[PDB]
């Protein structure tokens, strides 16, 4: 979820 | 004096000291990137390693957790190491993380190995933190010296002719291992092609062998892709990283592939490190999130 480039 | 630079880096790591400036001067950082780059270029794009060896996944600048890995799994050179990439970005100590790994590479060139991850390139570091960390804590010239070093990192490793190690995964155009050997270095990472796939792709339980990857680039490959790849090259296991997994490591497709992720509490996942014995037995050591 940190941004899908990837939680 | 590579020994003193390691002691300085590990001093800051043992104490947890957190400072804007790196414990190494920019002139020392420059010499480290120069020696490592030369060592990387003198070794193949596809490494062939013999066991025993321990395999480490994504670290992503979590320097304290790199210290925990070495403290628990053993410091070089009594433990032989293969890192699968993704050393920088996200973590607030990407500089200490990559600097310690490069120093160990300089000191133990034949017992310590670092593969390239998809974050070890110019464009990804500009988006995900390591560019800004170099600009704030060092300078842009130092960041360029790291990218020059990244562009020489090897792409994959084969352990005892049976374990294929890569950061991301497989590719529809991985038709021979020499295609990995013949990857010219130094090189940037293109938006497409075999090199991009090896650093960006992920496994999945999909209906089709190849599908576009939700990350926005490269592919996701199915169990069929793994089976065909292991059969064609006579490998027993694909060992890769790239993907965060809750229990630190996760086998896939009847234990024909394993993901090793070594950055605890990345988003509250465990961290894991895979050991390969002389008889090619695979065990794991865990790193708790907190
Ligand atoms: Mn990755
Ligand atoms: Mn990663």
Author numbering:
A (entry chain M): 1 to 7
B (entry chain A): 172 to 438, 442 to 464
Text from the published report:
Here, we describe the structure and function of the first member of a family of protein phosphatases that is specific to fungi, protein phosphatase Z1 (PPZ1) from Candida albicans. Like other fungus-specific phosphatases, C. albicans PPZ1 (484 amino acids [aa], 54.4 kDa) has two domains: an N-terminal intrinsically disordered protein (IDP) domain (aa 1 to 170 [PPZ1Nterm]) and a C-terminal catalytic domain (aa 171 to 484 [PPZ1cat]). PPZ1cat and human PP1α exhibit 66% sequence identity throughout their catalytic domains, and the 6 residues that coordinate the active site metals are 100% conserved. Furthermore, not only is PPZ1 important for cation homeostasis and cell wall biosynthesis, it is also critical for C. albicans virulence.
We also determined the structure of PPZ1cat bound to the marine toxin microcystin-LR (MC [PPZ1cat-MC]), a potent cyclic peptide inhibitor of PP1 (20). Both the MC-free and MC-bound structures of PPZ1cat are highly similar, with an RMSD of 0.54 Å. The largest difference is in the β12-β13 loop, which contains Cys438PPZ1. This cysteine forms a covalent bond with the bound MC identical to that observed in the PP1α-MC complex. Unexpectedly, the Z1-helix is also no longer ordered in the PPZ1cat-MC structure. This was not due to MC binding, but instead the Z1-helix was displaced by a symmetry-related molecule in the crystal. Importantly, the positions of L1 are identical between the PPZ1cat and PPZ1cat-MC structures, demonstrating that the conformation of L1 is intrinsic to PPZ1cat itself and not a consequence of Z1-helix binding. MC binds the active site of PPZ1cat essentially identically to that observed in PP1α. The orientation observed in PPZ1cat-MC is favored because a malonate ion from the crystallization mother liquor is bound in the rotomer position populated in the PP1α structure; thus both positions are expected to be equally likely in the absence of malonate.
